[PDB]
Amino acid sequence: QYEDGKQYTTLEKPVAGAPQVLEFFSFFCGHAYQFEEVLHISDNVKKKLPEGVKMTKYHVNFMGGDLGKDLTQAWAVAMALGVEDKVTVPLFEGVQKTQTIRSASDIRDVFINAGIKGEEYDAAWNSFVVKSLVAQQEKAAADVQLRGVPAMFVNGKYQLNPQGMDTSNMDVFVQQYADTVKYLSEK
């Protein structure tokens, strides 16, 4: 059962005001099948959380390019419009698989070919919701001294530690990972 150092580690400087459950990810990290494993785990942690506990997921630029920046703004657009589950795979496929995403217009087209209206994308993109969310994603990663993706944090205090878990089959991993998030959203 649960101890500091094993299933989770404790941030030396806790973050006040952090989301209750904060996951970080990048579109530029991992083989497509690896990216999709991470999505499965994230969706299963969501599923097994206690009613009322929300999961927040933030994007990370990784190499500092303008493509990375526009994708982080495009992620804030997905959060703003509640279309995360419609665009996550298309987006990474756009970057990773079909490699179609090269400019911000190409990102916008992923949203469109996924049934988001061009006029809707533009409004969110330019919105204050999205400016605030872009700032929040940048700030939160600096606040936890982020050392890589994927990563999950609970209450700005505890970081999930997949090392201290049985990663020798996904279903056991997922249950352990998910049970630990509950112990921490209670702690």
Curated annotation (Swiss-Prot):
SUPFAM superfamilies: Thioredoxin-like. It comes from Escherichia coli (strain K12). GO terms for cellular component: outer membrane-bounded periplasmic space. This is Thiol:disulfide interchange protein DsbA. Disruption phenotype: Induction of the PhoP/PhoQ two-component regulatory system, suppressed by 50 uM CuSO(4). It is found in: Periplasm. InterPro entries: DSBA-like_thioredoxin_dom, DsbA/DsbL, Thiol_disulfide_DsbA, Thioredoxin-like_sf, Thioredoxin_CS, Thioredoxin_domain. Keywords: Disulfide bond, Periplasm, Redox-active center, Signal. Disulfide bonds join 29-32. Residues 1-130 form the Thioredoxin domain. One of its GO terms (molecular function) is protein-disulfide reductase activity. GO terms for biological process: cellular response to antibiotic. Required for disulfide bond formation in some periplasmic proteins such as PhoA or OmpA. Acts by transferring its disulfide bond to other proteins and is reduced in the process. DsbA is reoxidized by DsbB. Required for pilus biogenesis. PhoP-regulated transcription is redox-sensitive, being activated when the periplasm becomes more reducing (deletion of dsbA/dsbB, treatment with dithiothreitol). MgrB acts between DsbA/DsbB and PhoP/PhoQ in this pathway. Its main location: periplasm. Belongs to the thioredoxin family. DsbA subfamily.
